[PDB]
Coordinates of C-alpha atoms and ligand atoms in Angstrom, one line a residue:
Chain W
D1 CA 8.0 5.3 8.0
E2 CA 11.8 3.7 6.6
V3 CA 13.1 1.1 5.3
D4 CA 15.5 -1.5 6.6
Chain X
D1 CA -2.0 -37.3 7.0
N2 CA -2.2 -34.0 5.1
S3 CA -1.4 -32.2 7.7
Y4 CA 1.8 -32.0 10.2
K5 CA 1.9 -33.5 13.2
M6 CA 1.8 -30.6 15.5
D7 CA 0.7 -32.5 18.8
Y8 CA 4.3 -33.7 20.1
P9 CA 4.6 -32.6 23.5
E10 CA 6.0 -29.1 22.5
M11 CA 5.2 -26.3 19.6
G12 CA 8.8 -26.3 19.9
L13 CA 11.5 -23.9 19.8
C14 CA 10.9 -19.2 18.9
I15 CA 13.6 -18.1 18.1
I16 CA 14.0 -14.0 18.1
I17 CA 17.1 -12.1 16.6
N18 CA 15.8 -8.5 17.1
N19 CA 19.0 -6.0 15.8
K20 CA 18.1 -2.6 16.9
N21 CA 21.4 -0.9 17.2
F22 CA 24.5 -1.8 14.7
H23 CA 27.7 -0.9 14.8
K24 CA 29.2 2.4 14.5
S25 CA 31.8 1.2 11.4
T26 CA 29.0 -0.1 8.9
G27 CA 26.9 3.2 8.8
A28 CA 23.4 0.7 9.0
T29 CA 20.6 3.1 11.2
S30 CA 19.2 2.1 14.1
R31 CA 16.1 -0.2 13.2
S32 CA 13.1 2.7 15.9
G33 CA 10.4 0.3 16.1
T34 CA 11.8 -3.0 16.8
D35 CA 11.4 -3.3 19.8
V36 CA 7.9 -3.1 19.0
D37 CA 8.2 -6.2 16.8
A38 CA 9.9 -8.1 19.1
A39 CA 7.5 -7.7 22.0
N40 CA 4.4 -8.2 19.6
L41 CA 6.1 -11.5 18.7
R42 CA 6.6 -13.5 21.7
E43 CA 3.3 -12.9 22.9
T44 CA 2.1 -13.8 19.4
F45 CA 3.7 -17.0 19.5
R46 CA 3.7 -17.4 23.5
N47 CA 0.3 -17.8 22.8
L48 CA 0.3 -20.9 20.1
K49 CA 2.1 -22.6 22.8
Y50 CA 5.9 -22.1 21.9
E51 CA 9.0 -21.3 24.2
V52 CA 10.1 -18.7 23.3
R53 CA 13.4 -16.7 23.1
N54 CA 14.6 -13.5 22.7
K55 CA 17.8 -12.4 21.4
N56 CA 18.9 -8.9 21.0
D57 CA 21.3 -7.0 19.4
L58 CA 23.5 -10.2 18.1
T59 CA 26.7 -9.6 15.4
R60 CA 26.4 -12.1 12.5
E61 CA 29.1 -14.2 14.3
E62 CA 26.5 -14.4 17.1
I63 CA 23.9 -15.5 14.8
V64 CA 25.9 -17.9 12.7
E65 CA 26.7 -20.0 16.4
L66 CA 23.0 -19.5 18.0
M67 CA 22.1 -21.3 15.3
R68 CA 24.2 -23.9 15.0
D69 CA 23.6 -24.2 19.2
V70 CA 19.9 -24.4 18.5
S71 CA 20.1 -26.9 15.7
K72 CA 22.6 -29.5 17.7
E73 CA 19.6 -28.8 20.4
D74 CA 17.2 -32.7 20.3
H75 CA 14.2 -31.3 19.0
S76 CA 12.4 -34.8 19.5
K77 CA 9.7 -34.1 21.4
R78 CA 9.0 -30.6 19.6
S79 CA 7.3 -30.1 16.4
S80 CA 7.9 -27.6 15.0
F81 CA 10.4 -24.7 14.6
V82 CA 10.0 -21.1 14.4
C83 CA 13.1 -18.6 13.8
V84 CA 12.5 -15.5 13.2
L85 CA 14.9 -12.3 11.9
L86 CA 14.1 -8.8 12.3
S87 CA 17.4 -6.8 10.8
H88 CA 19.1 -4.9 7.8
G89 CA 19.2 -6.8 4.8
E90 CA 19.7 -7.6 1.1
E91 CA 19.0 -10.0 -1.1
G92 CA 19.8 -12.9 0.5
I93 CA 21.4 -10.9 3.2
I94 CA 20.6 -10.0 6.9
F95 CA 22.5 -8.2 9.3
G96 CA 24.2 -8.9 12.2
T97 CA 25.3 -5.5 14.2
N98 CA 28.6 -5.5 12.9
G99 CA 27.5 -6.4 8.8
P100 CA 26.4 -8.9 7.0
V101 CA 25.9 -12.6 6.9
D102 CA 24.7 -15.0 3.9
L103 CA 20.9 -16.4 5.0
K104 CA 21.3 -19.7 3.4
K105 CA 24.6 -20.0 5.7
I106 CA 21.4 -20.1 8.4
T107 CA 19.4 -22.2 7.4
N108 CA 21.8 -24.9 6.8
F109 CA 21.5 -25.9 9.8
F110 CA 17.5 -26.7 9.5
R111 CA 18.5 -29.0 6.5
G112 CA 16.9 -32.3 6.8
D113 CA 20.2 -34.4 7.0
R114 CA 22.1 -32.2 9.6
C115 CA 19.3 -31.6 12.1
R116 CA 18.0 -34.7 12.0
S117 CA 15.1 -34.6 15.2
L118 CA 13.6 -31.9 13.0
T119 CA 13.5 -34.2 10.1
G120 CA 10.1 -34.0 8.5
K121 CA 8.8 -30.9 10.6
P122 CA 8.1 -27.3 9.3
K123 CA 10.2 -24.8 10.2
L124 CA 9.7 -21.4 9.6
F125 CA 12.2 -18.4 9.1
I126 CA 10.2 -14.9 8.7
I127 CA 12.6 -12.2 8.2
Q128 CA 11.5 -8.8 8.7
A129 CA 14.6 -7.2 6.3
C130 CA 14.7 -5.1 3.2
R131 CA 15.7 -7.5 0.0
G132 CA 17.7 -4.8 -1.6
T133 CA 16.7 -1.3 -2.6
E134 CA 13.0 -1.1 -5.5
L135 CA 10.2 0.9 -4.1
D136 CA 7.1 -0.3 -5.3
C137 CA 4.9 2.8 -6.3
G138 CA 1.4 0.7 -6.5
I139 CA -1.3 1.1 -8.5
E140 CA -5.0 2.6 -8.6
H141 CA 12.5 -43.6 1.3
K142 CA 14.5 -40.8 1.1
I143 CA 13.0 -36.4 1.9
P144 CA 15.2 -33.5 0.2
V145 CA 17.1 -31.8 3.0
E146 CA 15.2 -28.8 1.8
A147 CA 11.4 -30.7 2.3
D148 CA 10.2 -28.9 5.0
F149 CA 11.1 -25.6 5.5
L150 CA 9.2 -22.2 4.4
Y151 CA 10.3 -18.8 4.7
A152 CA 7.8 -16.2 5.6
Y153 CA 9.4 -13.0 4.0
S154 CA 8.9 -9.5 4.4
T155 CA 9.0 -7.9 1.5
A156 CA 8.8 -8.8 -2.9
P157 CA 12.5 -10.0 -3.8
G158 CA 14.9 -6.6 -4.6
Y159 CA 12.1 -4.6 -2.6
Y160 CA 12.8 -2.8 0.2
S161 CA 11.0 -3.6 3.7
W162 CA 8.7 -0.9 5.2
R163 CA 9.0 0.1 9.1
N164 CA 7.8 2.6 11.0
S165 CA 9.6 4.2 13.9
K166 CA 6.4 4.3 16.6
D167 CA 3.9 0.9 15.6
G168 CA 6.7 -1.4 14.4
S169 CA 7.0 -2.9 10.5
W170 CA 3.9 -3.5 8.1
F171 CA 4.5 -6.8 8.1
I172 CA 4.9 -8.7 11.8
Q173 CA 2.4 -6.2 13.0
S174 CA 0.6 -7.8 10.4
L175 CA 1.6 -11.0 10.9
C176 CA 1.2 -10.7 15.1
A177 CA -2.5 -9.3 14.3
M178 CA -3.7 -12.7 11.2
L179 CA -2.1 -14.7 13.8
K180 CA -4.0 -13.7 16.6
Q181 CA -6.9 -13.5 14.7
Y182 CA -7.3 -16.8 12.9
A183 CA -4.7 -19.6 14.2
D184 CA -7.5 -21.1 15.5
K185 CA -9.7 -21.1 12.3
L186 CA -7.0 -21.3 9.6
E187 CA -4.4 -23.3 7.9
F188 CA -1.4 -21.3 8.3
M189 CA -0.8 -20.6 4.2
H190 CA -4.3 -18.6 4.2
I191 CA -3.2 -16.9 7.5
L192 CA -0.2 -15.7 5.6
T193 CA -2.6 -14.8 2.7
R194 CA -4.5 -12.7 4.7
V195 CA -0.9 -10.7 6.6
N196 CA -0.6 -10.4 1.9
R197 CA -3.2 -8.3 1.5
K198 CA -3.6 -6.5 5.4
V199 CA 0.0 -5.5 4.0
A200 CA -0.7 -4.5 0.5
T201 CA -4.2 -2.7 1.7
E202 CA -3.8 -0.6 4.7
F203 CA -0.4 0.6 4.7
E204 CA 1.4 3.6 2.1
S205 CA 4.5 5.1 3.3
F206 CA 4.6 8.7 4.9
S207 CA 7.7 10.5 4.1
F208 CA 8.7 14.0 2.9
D209 CA 11.0 12.6 0.4
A210 CA 8.9 12.5 -2.5
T211 CA 11.9 9.7 -4.0
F212 CA 10.0 7.7 -0.2
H213 CA 6.2 9.1 0.0
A214 CA 3.0 6.9 -1.5
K215 CA 4.9 3.5 -1.5
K216 CA 3.5 -0.1 -1.0
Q217 CA 4.7 -3.2 -0.2
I218 CA 3.4 -7.0 -0.5
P219 CA 5.4 -9.7 1.3
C220 CA 6.5 -12.9 -0.3
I221 CA 5.7 -15.7 1.2
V222 CA 7.9 -18.9 0.3
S223 CA 6.5 -22.6 0.8
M224 CA 8.3 -25.9 0.5
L225 CA 5.9 -27.2 2.9
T226 CA 4.9 -31.2 2.2
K227 CA 2.1 -30.8 4.6
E228 CA -0.5 -27.9 5.9
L229 CA 0.2 -26.4 9.0
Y230 CA -2.5 -26.0 11.9
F231 CA -1.8 -24.2 14.8
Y232 CA -4.3 -26.1 16.3
Chain Y
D1 CA -13.4 -10.8 -0.4
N2 CA -11.2 -13.9 1.2
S3 CA -10.7 -15.2 -2.3
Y4 CA -10.7 -14.2 -5.7
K5 CA -14.1 -13.4 -8.0
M6 CA -13.6 -16.4 -10.2
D7 CA -16.9 -15.7 -11.7
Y8 CA -16.0 -13.3 -14.7
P9 CA -16.9 -14.7 -18.2
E10 CA -14.2 -16.4 -19.5
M11 CA -10.9 -17.9 -16.7
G12 CA -8.2 -16.6 -18.3
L13 CA -5.7 -17.0 -20.7
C14 CA -3.7 -20.6 -20.4
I15 CA -0.1 -19.9 -21.8
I16 CA 2.3 -22.7 -22.5
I17 CA 5.8 -22.0 -23.7
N18 CA 7.6 -25.7 -24.6
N19 CA 10.7 -25.2 -25.6
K20 CA 12.1 -28.9 -26.9
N21 CA 14.3 -28.2 -28.8
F22 CA 17.6 -25.3 -28.5
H23 CA 19.9 -23.4 -30.3
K24 CA 23.7 -24.8 -31.2
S25 CA 25.0 -21.1 -30.3
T26 CA 23.5 -22.1 -26.5
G27 CA 24.6 -25.3 -26.2
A28 CA 21.7 -26.9 -24.7
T29 CA 20.5 -30.4 -24.4
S30 CA 16.9 -31.4 -26.5
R31 CA 14.2 -31.7 -23.4
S32 CA 12.6 -35.0 -23.7
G33 CA 9.9 -35.5 -22.3
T34 CA 8.6 -32.1 -22.2
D35 CA 5.9 -33.2 -25.0
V36 CA 4.2 -35.0 -23.0
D37 CA 4.3 -32.5 -20.0
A38 CA 3.1 -29.7 -22.1
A39 CA -0.1 -32.6 -24.0
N40 CA -0.6 -32.9 -19.8
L41 CA -0.7 -29.0 -19.3
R42 CA -2.6 -28.5 -22.4
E43 CA -5.6 -30.8 -21.0
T44 CA -5.5 -29.9 -17.4
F45 CA -6.3 -26.8 -17.8
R46 CA -9.1 -27.6 -21.0
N47 CA -10.3 -29.5 -18.2
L48 CA -10.2 -26.2 -15.9
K49 CA -12.2 -24.4 -18.8
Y50 CA -9.2 -21.4 -19.3
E51 CA -8.3 -20.5 -23.2
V52 CA -5.3 -22.6 -24.0
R53 CA -2.2 -21.7 -25.7
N54 CA 0.3 -23.8 -26.8
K55 CA 3.3 -22.5 -28.2
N56 CA 6.7 -24.4 -29.1
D57 CA 10.1 -23.0 -29.2
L58 CA 10.0 -19.9 -28.8
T59 CA 14.0 -17.8 -28.9
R60 CA 13.8 -15.4 -26.1
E61 CA 13.1 -12.8 -28.6
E62 CA 9.5 -14.3 -29.2
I63 CA 9.0 -15.0 -25.8
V64 CA 9.7 -11.6 -24.7
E65 CA 7.0 -10.4 -27.6
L66 CA 4.6 -12.8 -27.2
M67 CA 4.1 -11.9 -23.7
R68 CA 4.0 -8.3 -24.0
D69 CA 1.9 -8.8 -26.8
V70 CA -0.4 -10.5 -24.2
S71 CA -0.7 -8.1 -21.7
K72 CA -1.3 -6.1 -24.1
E73 CA -5.2 -8.0 -25.0
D74 CA -8.1 -6.7 -22.7
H75 CA -8.7 -9.4 -19.9
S76 CA -11.4 -7.4 -18.7
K77 CA -14.2 -10.4 -18.9
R78 CA -11.2 -13.3 -17.2
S79 CA -11.3 -14.3 -13.9
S80 CA -7.4 -14.5 -14.3
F81 CA -3.9 -15.3 -16.1
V82 CA -1.6 -18.3 -16.5
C83 CA 1.7 -18.8 -17.9
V84 CA 3.3 -22.3 -17.7
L85 CA 7.7 -21.9 -18.7
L86 CA 8.2 -25.2 -19.7
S87 CA 12.5 -24.7 -20.9
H88 CA 16.0 -24.8 -19.5
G89 CA 16.5 -22.1 -16.8
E90 CA 19.2 -20.9 -14.2
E91 CA 18.7 -18.8 -11.2
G92 CA 16.3 -16.0 -12.5
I93 CA 16.4 -17.2 -15.5
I94 CA 14.1 -18.9 -18.7
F95 CA 16.1 -20.1 -21.4
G96 CA 14.6 -19.0 -25.2
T97 CA 15.7 -21.5 -27.9
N98 CA 18.9 -18.8 -28.5
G99 CA 19.9 -17.8 -24.7
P100 CA 18.2 -16.6 -21.8
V101 CA 15.5 -14.4 -20.4
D102 CA 15.3 -13.1 -16.8
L103 CA 12.1 -13.9 -15.6
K104 CA 11.4 -10.9 -14.6
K105 CA 11.5 -9.0 -17.9
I106 CA 8.6 -12.0 -18.3
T107 CA 6.7 -10.9 -15.3
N108 CA 7.3 -7.4 -15.7
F109 CA 4.8 -6.8 -18.3
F110 CA 1.9 -7.6 -16.6
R111 CA 2.6 -6.0 -13.8
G112 CA -0.4 -4.2 -11.8
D113 CA 0.2 -0.9 -13.2
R114 CA 1.2 -2.3 -16.6
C115 CA -1.8 -4.5 -17.9
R116 CA -4.9 -2.7 -15.6
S117 CA -7.8 -5.5 -17.3
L118 CA -5.3 -7.7 -14.6
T119 CA -5.5 -5.4 -12.0
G120 CA -6.2 -7.0 -9.1
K121 CA -6.9 -10.8 -10.9
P122 CA -4.2 -13.9 -10.2
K123 CA -1.6 -13.9 -12.1
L124 CA -0.1 -17.4 -12.1
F125 CA 3.7 -18.4 -13.2
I126 CA 4.3 -22.1 -13.8
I127 CA 8.1 -22.7 -14.2
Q128 CA 9.3 -26.3 -15.1
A129 CA 13.6 -25.8 -15.2
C130 CA 16.8 -25.0 -12.9
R131 CA 17.3 -23.0 -11.0
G132 CA 20.8 -23.4 -10.6
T133 CA 23.0 -26.4 -10.3
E134 CA 23.4 -28.4 -6.7
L135 CA 21.3 -31.5 -5.9
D136 CA 19.6 -32.6 -3.1
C137 CA 20.8 -35.6 -1.8
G138 CA 17.7 -36.6 0.4
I139 CA 17.6 -38.1 3.8
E140 CA 16.2 -40.1 5.9
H141 CA -6.7 3.3 -2.8
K142 CA -3.2 1.1 -4.0
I143 CA -2.1 -2.1 -4.4
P144 CA 1.7 -3.2 -5.1
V145 CA 2.4 -3.5 -8.4
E146 CA 4.1 -6.7 -7.3
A147 CA 0.8 -8.0 -5.6
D148 CA -1.5 -11.1 -6.9
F149 CA 1.4 -12.9 -8.8
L150 CA 2.0 -17.1 -8.0
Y151 CA 5.2 -18.0 -9.3
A152 CA 5.1 -21.6 -8.8
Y153 CA 8.0 -22.9 -9.3
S154 CA 9.2 -26.4 -9.7
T155 CA 12.3 -26.9 -7.6
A156 CA 14.2 -24.8 -4.8
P157 CA 16.2 -21.8 -5.5
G158 CA 19.8 -22.9 -6.7
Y159 CA 18.6 -26.6 -7.6
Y160 CA 18.4 -28.7 -10.5
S161 CA 14.9 -29.6 -11.6
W162 CA 14.5 -33.3 -13.5
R163 CA 12.5 -34.3 -15.9
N164 CA 11.4 -37.8 -17.3
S165 CA 12.4 -38.7 -21.4
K166 CA 9.2 -41.0 -20.9
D167 CA 7.0 -39.6 -17.8
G168 CA 7.7 -35.7 -18.3
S169 CA 8.6 -33.4 -15.6
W170 CA 8.1 -34.5 -11.6
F171 CA 7.3 -31.5 -11.1
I172 CA 4.6 -31.2 -13.8
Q173 CA 3.5 -35.0 -13.8
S174 CA 2.6 -34.2 -10.3
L175 CA 0.5 -30.8 -10.3
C176 CA -1.4 -31.5 -13.3
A177 CA -2.2 -34.9 -11.1
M178 CA -3.1 -32.8 -8.0
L179 CA -5.1 -30.5 -10.1
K180 CA -7.1 -33.3 -12.1
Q181 CA -7.8 -34.7 -8.3
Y182 CA -8.4 -31.3 -6.5
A183 CA -9.0 -28.5 -8.1
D184 CA -12.6 -28.9 -7.6
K185 CA -11.9 -29.9 -3.8
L186 CA -9.0 -27.6 -2.6
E187 CA -8.4 -24.3 -2.7
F188 CA -4.9 -23.8 -5.3
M189 CA -2.0 -22.8 -2.4
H190 CA -3.4 -26.2 -0.8
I191 CA -2.9 -28.0 -4.3
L192 CA 0.2 -27.2 -4.5
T193 CA 0.9 -28.3 -1.0
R194 CA -0.2 -31.8 -2.2
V195 CA 2.5 -31.0 -5.6
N196 CA 5.1 -30.2 -2.9
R197 CA 4.0 -33.9 -1.2
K198 CA 4.1 -35.8 -4.3
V199 CA 7.4 -35.0 -6.3
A200 CA 9.0 -34.5 -2.4
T201 CA 8.6 -38.7 -1.6
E202 CA 7.7 -40.1 -4.7
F203 CA 10.3 -38.9 -7.0
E204 CA 13.5 -40.4 -6.9
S205 CA 16.1 -40.0 -9.5
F206 CA 17.7 -43.4 -10.6
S207 CA 21.3 -42.8 -13.0
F208 CA 24.1 -44.2 -14.4
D209 CA 26.5 -42.0 -12.9
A210 CA 26.5 -42.3 -9.3
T211 CA 27.0 -38.5 -8.7
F212 CA 23.7 -38.2 -10.4
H213 CA 21.5 -41.0 -8.6
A214 CA 19.6 -41.7 -6.1
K215 CA 18.7 -37.4 -5.9
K216 CA 15.4 -35.7 -4.9
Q217 CA 13.3 -32.7 -5.4
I218 CA 11.4 -30.1 -3.4
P219 CA 9.1 -27.6 -5.7
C220 CA 8.8 -23.9 -4.6
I221 CA 5.8 -22.0 -3.9
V222 CA 6.8 -18.2 -4.1
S223 CA 3.3 -16.5 -3.3
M224 CA 2.2 -12.3 -3.3
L225 CA -1.2 -13.1 -3.3
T226 CA -3.8 -11.8 -1.6
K227 CA -6.6 -13.4 -1.6
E228 CA -7.7 -17.2 -2.1
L229 CA -8.1 -18.7 -5.1
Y230 CA -10.3 -21.3 -6.1
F231 CA -10.8 -23.6 -9.9
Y232 CA -14.6 -23.8 -9.1
Chain A
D1 CA 15.6 -39.5 -15.8
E2 CA 17.3 -36.1 -17.2
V3 CA 17.9 -32.7 -15.1
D4 CA 16.3 -29.1 -17.2
Ligands
CL301 CL1 7.0 -5.0 -4.5

């Protein structure tokens, strides 16, 4: 899981 | 009558802008997992009978140019228009590979007075991108030129948006699944509401970093539509 | 579990904040026609079995205090919560009689983690207020704390919202009419979509000032709801 | 007609  | 006319000869275009790799000088990270999104969207909208055009790694100038050109096509035989943006972003902003551009600049090309062959037709903008840096910790004779737009945002105003490097983004994963399951059964707003529930209930971040761990997401439907939208 | 549980003993509160007269410190014109709105809403939501509370001419402090106190009530036996804001505004902002307050400050009291007796229940904010000064010239285990909100804006981001001094605002006129006609037939998003069409098609401004004449309006549905909402 |  990563953020944009 | 209460429904958009969706039996023009063509359903319409589906433009997918897939930005994965960004210029080093922007400091923007590579968006691992976005190709899974782009492929899922392509197949999903293919089955809805959209003419899909996938574009990859566009500068902000190329995005604007693309949108201007597409808005200048003759859409008279098309029922609708769909644009999907996959990128980094902040509130009101999407990233080209070399920097930000205002979402308003992109969508303005399709205003009721600027793209006449789409006047009165549903214009859908699907946006996988952060809208800021907040984290959700969870609990427990004329028509308006702004009419007939829908903006399906991946996340609430002010918030990060989550993307899994293996599975793709939470929102696009859920959107394609709900379209596949329900596009033959439900009006678009009710499909998007299912997407809202799926993202809110089935996803939660896993991180070794406590600040980013166990976080939640709610997408954000923004509708200026004047009629019901059915894909059948 | 596709639709919200609406068979609690009580439908819930409907708080109507009706700001007509503004202190000299803000400038701000008297909002002629807003009492027509407030009355129409009271009657409309009375018929929907809401516990209606009308508040008139509240300072921004009083608005914040009212929302705080209401969020501290026990809503366990209520299906939902409705707040209607009638006032001047700017993007992201509603006016107390004595100045602007952030909408975010008002809605935060009802976050899933801050008002536990409304967690998982629909929280509706209905906003008749400008969101800017643009004119539309027309053409032709956990859930997110931001989940289960619906913001029914009278107008698109960046735009004026129109109010008739005799008939009430375009949006509230249309909202009450569509609720009266369709609350026993349609899901709420479909009701609001009818409201969008009514505002978009049946209203056009008339002004002796050419700059404000023949202008149009589209409302703006913003949904973070996770389920369908029926009033019957 | 007036604006809010
Ligand atoms: Cl959120």
